């Protein structure tokens, strides 16, 4: 049944709750972003109001064929009324179109639902600065101190410098980047920019990108693989067998592959700096795992929460085991005692 952490008290609202059938007493279904674990259940057959960003609403219409009359896009950073309740959508610094939602309850309670987010000090100057938030529904993906990772900017610098050096040393090398969802577009776009290439991809993935309101996108991507030396493939194909296979398909235009897998966290983070990352190599194929995250590190999460000073935290991630739930609750209490709220 729908878990309590997807329901907003004092309203008829749910968040990211599309896979439970008709949720009893739900008048409006919010969707924070277009990732499958969150939209699971939506289709052209859905006939309740979906509230979301503009970009999310483009993907719902074009990719899932949801009917236009049930898509209610809202502008960001704008006080809006939904079924008699004031709400605001804020940028979540996750994937394109991802939002956090502020709910102003009739009784005076203020609730923030982060959806999925990568906390940033820039959030401390949004409309969140303007009033007190009583309850926080928190993306706790990486809520443990072992989870460190570099800035997105440091990771993109490493990727651009590695790609540029490789292709300048061997003008017959092909670059390949993995993907399985929207998000992390900077990785393949930054690499294509330094190389003076468009990124080549499947018609399905091209259609997905054309929904994202990214400026000048027609100048950066293409479905003509032959004209491109940065290719995007399913993340599943980013292995020596899949890459050898792909190389055959390019008809001797290329004699080497340099591939990137933009992972979340992986344990070499606990030891190794970005400067010191090395690839796995077999013959003329090299694969780099790069820690490009669109979720908060432990320290980023901690800073946001100690800034906001909520009265109550409701985790939305890692809630399935008692050991995770108890570990998370211990961190929340530490943060509260350290900061004095
Ligand atoms: Ni997500």
UniProtKB/Swiss-Prot annotation:
Disulfide bonds: none annotated. It is found in: Nucleus. Expressed in brain, heart, kidney, liver, pancreas, placenta and skeletal muscle. It comes from the Eukaryota. Induction: During mitosis. The mRNA encoding this protein contains an internal ribosome entry site (IRES) in its 5'-UTR. This 5'-UTR generally suppresses translation while specifically promoting expression during mitosis, when cap-dependent translation may be impaired. May be required for DNA interstrand cross-link repair. Also required for checkpoint mediated cell cycle arrest in early prophase in response to mitotic spindle poisons. Possesses beta-lactamase activity, catalyzing the hydrolysis of penicillin G and nitrocefin. Exhibits no activity towards other beta-lactam antibiotic classes including cephalosporins (cefotaxime) and carbapenems (imipenem). Binds constitutively to TP53BP1. Binds CDC27, which is itself a component of the anaphase promoting complex (APC). Binds PIAS1. Belongs to the DNA repair metallo-beta-lactamase (DRMBL) family. This is DNA cross-link repair 1A protein. It comes from Homo sapiens (Human). The gene is DCLRE1A. The chain holds residues 700 to 1040 of 1040 of the full protein.
């Amino acid at each position: 049944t729908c878990p309590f952490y997807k329901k907003i008290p004092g309203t008829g609202f749910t968040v990211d709750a599309f896979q439970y059938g008709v949720v009893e007493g739900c008048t409006a279904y919010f969707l924070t972003h277009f990732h499958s674990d969150h939209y699971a259940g939506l289709s052209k057959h859905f006939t309740f109001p979906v509230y979301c960003s503009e970009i999310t609403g483009n993907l719902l219409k074009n990719k899932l064929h949801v009917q236009e009359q049930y898509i209610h896009p809202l502008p960001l950073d704008t006080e809006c009324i939904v079924n008699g309740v004031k709400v605001v959508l804020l940028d979540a610094n996750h994937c394109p179109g991802a939002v956090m939602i502020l709910f102003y309850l009739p009784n005076g309670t203020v609730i923030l639902h982060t959806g999925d987010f990568r906390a940033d000090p820039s959030m401390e100057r949004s409309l969140l600065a303007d009033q007190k938030v009583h309850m926080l529904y928190l993306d706790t993906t990486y809520c443990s101190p072992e989870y460190t990772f570099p800035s997105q900017q440091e990771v993109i610098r490493f990727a651009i410098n590695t790609a540029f050096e490789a292709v300048t040393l061997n003008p017959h090398a092909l670059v390949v980047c993995g993907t399985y969802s929207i998000g992390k577009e900077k990785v393949f776009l930054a690499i294509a920019d330094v190389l003076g290439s468009k990124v080549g991809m499947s018609q399905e993935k091209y259609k997905t990108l054309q929904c994202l309101n990214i400026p000048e996108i027609n100048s950066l991507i293409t479905t003509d693989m032959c004209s491109s030396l940065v290719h995007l493939l399913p993340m599943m194909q980013i292995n020596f067998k899949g890459l050898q296979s792909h190389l055959k398909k390019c008809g001797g235009k290329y004699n080497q592959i340099l591939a990137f897998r933009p992972t979340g966290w992986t344990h070499s983070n606990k030891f190794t700096r970005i400067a010191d990352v090395i690839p796995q190599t077999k013959g003329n194929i090299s694969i780099y795992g790069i820690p490009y995250s669109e979720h908060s590190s432990y320290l980023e999460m901690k800073r946001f929460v100690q800034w906001l000073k909520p009265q109550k935290i409701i985790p939305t991630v890692n809630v399935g085991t008692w050991k995770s739930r108890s570990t998370m609750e211990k961190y929340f209490r530490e943060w509260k005692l350290e900061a004095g709220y």
